[PDB]
Amino acid sequence: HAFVSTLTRGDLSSIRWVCSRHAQPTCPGAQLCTVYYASLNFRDIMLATGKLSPDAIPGKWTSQDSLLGMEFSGRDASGKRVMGLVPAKGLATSVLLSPDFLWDVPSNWTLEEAASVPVVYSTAYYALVVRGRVRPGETLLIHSGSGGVGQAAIAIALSLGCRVFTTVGSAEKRAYLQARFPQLDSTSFANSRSFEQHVLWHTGGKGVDLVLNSLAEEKLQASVRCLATHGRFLEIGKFDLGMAIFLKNVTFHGVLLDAFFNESSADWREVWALVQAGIRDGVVRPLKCTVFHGAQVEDAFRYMAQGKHIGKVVVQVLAEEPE
């Protein structure tokens, strides 16, 4: 067994593979999977650079545990291709996890790209459907549309018949989204020319019903101004109060999946089912992947941290075998 860990806490240059046989659990509640690809998420960057303490992550961890890695694709003990969510420790040669957090990988998918799906789509479905309760014909404002969760949210929003507005960091990102999502038109892109004025003008002065991730971009105040009454804010936890909030009867939803691995495990399969149905119906599409050899894991992190990429940064722990 081997996992990725920073030698000295907070130093990304000290990152390396620590090597060392984990037993197969008999009980149906736990399962040992072989990791082929492990995706990087922003939290992994926060942990490795020391901006985030592992003591902050919920669960039962020891002082020697490395929590790097939140999602993977690979094979179960029987050799079936799977992808899954893990509370931590995804960046390893094998993962021990509950089968409740596994999905089968569609035959037309590569293992490589399947690794990009679990976190962003589980997060987007939980936020929009379970928490946001999106309804057809409602309007959404998705900040950072080309970002991982943004892309998932756009795909889900459009599938449920919702009208989508988004903000993006660049023309390239705008161009990418327009091509990936032909249902979008030029009016969908709110920050190409302020975004709140744009939204108001294309919502009959009424504003949008839901806003996703305004805090990450520091666009909350502006977002309230183009929010409809009884609007809902959806904000995914990132480890880094005007009167309008009350007059408009605004609701704020703080969102993270960590609880589903713990005290909220009884409510997880609702989210699991949403992802599964989305896969079946073609809504859930793998993101674009930039792949690094596991031996270049440090390079993957530094590349990820720059945040200039589109899609997912994936680490190849074990190359998928030829068919």
The string of DSSP codes covering 77-125 is TT--EEEEE-SS--SBSEEEE-GGGEEEPPTTS-HHHHTTSHHHHHHHH
94 or 213: whose CB is closer to ligand TCL? 213
> Binding site annotation covers 84?
no
What residues contact 261, with CB distance under 8 A and at least 6 apart? Answer: 58, 59, 85, 86, 87, 98, 101
63 or 249: whose CB is closer to a copy of itself? 249
256 binds ligand TCL (CB under 6 A): no
Give the single-character DSSP code of 189. Answer: B
> Binding site annotation covers 2?
no
58 binds a copy of itself (CB under 8 A): yes
153 or 224: whose CB is closer to ligand TCL? 224
Distance of CA 132 to the CA centre of its chain: 16
Contact residue for ligand TCL among 37, 233, 261, 292 (CB under 6 A):
233
Tokens of 201: 């003008």
> Binding site annotation covers 151?
yes
Strand partners, 33: 95
Contact residue for ligand TCL among 32, 57, 245, 318 (CB under 6 A):
245
42 binds Na ion (CB under 5 A): yes
Question: Minimum distance between the CB of residue 233 and a copy of itself, rounded to whole angstroms?
Answer: 9
68 or 220: whose CB is closer to ligand TCL? 220
Choose among 98, 46, 53, 95: nearest CA to 75.
95
Q: Identify the residue whose tokens are 């090597």.
A: 19
Give the number of other CB atoms < 10 A from CB of residue 237. Answer: 13
Does residue 142 contact residue 166 with C-beta atoms inside 8 Å?
A: yes
Please calculate the CA angle 41-145-218 and round it to the nearest 5 degrees.
80
Query: Distance between CA 197 and CA 190 in Å, rounded?
Result: 9
Question: Minimum distance between the CB of residue 261 and Na ion, rounded to whole angstroms?
Answer: 16
Contact residue for ligand TCL among 47, 250, 297, 314 (CB under 6 A):
250
239 binds a copy of itself (CB under 8 A): yes
59 binds a copy of itself (CB under 8 A): no
Cα torsion 47, 49, 55, 59 to 10°: value is 10
Question: Minimum distance between the CB of residue 46 and Na ion, rounded to whole angstroms?
Answer: 5
Query: Distance between CA 12 and CA 8 in Å, rounded?
Result: 8
43 binds Na ion (CB under 5 A): yes
119 or 283: whose CB is closer to a copy of itself? 119
Q: Which residues does a gap of C–N over 2.5 Å follow in the chain? A: 20, 193, 240
251 binds a copy of itself (CB under 8 A): yes
> Binding site annotation covers 245?
no
Question: Minimum distance between the CB of residue 247 and a copy of itself, rounded to whole angstroms?
Answer: 5
115 or 142: whose CB is closer to ligand TCL? 142
52 or 228: whose CB is closer to Cl ion? 52
Question: Minimum distance between the CB of residue 54 and a copy of itself, rounded to whole angstroms?
Answer: 13
Would you list which residues are annotated within the binding site for NADP(+)?
140-157
Would you list which residues are annotated within the binding site?
140-157
Binding site for a copy of itself (CB under 8 A): 56, 58, 131, 215, 229-230, 235-237, 239, 241, 243, 245-256, 258-259, 263-264, 267
Binding site for Na ion (CB under 5 A): 42-43, 46, 238-239
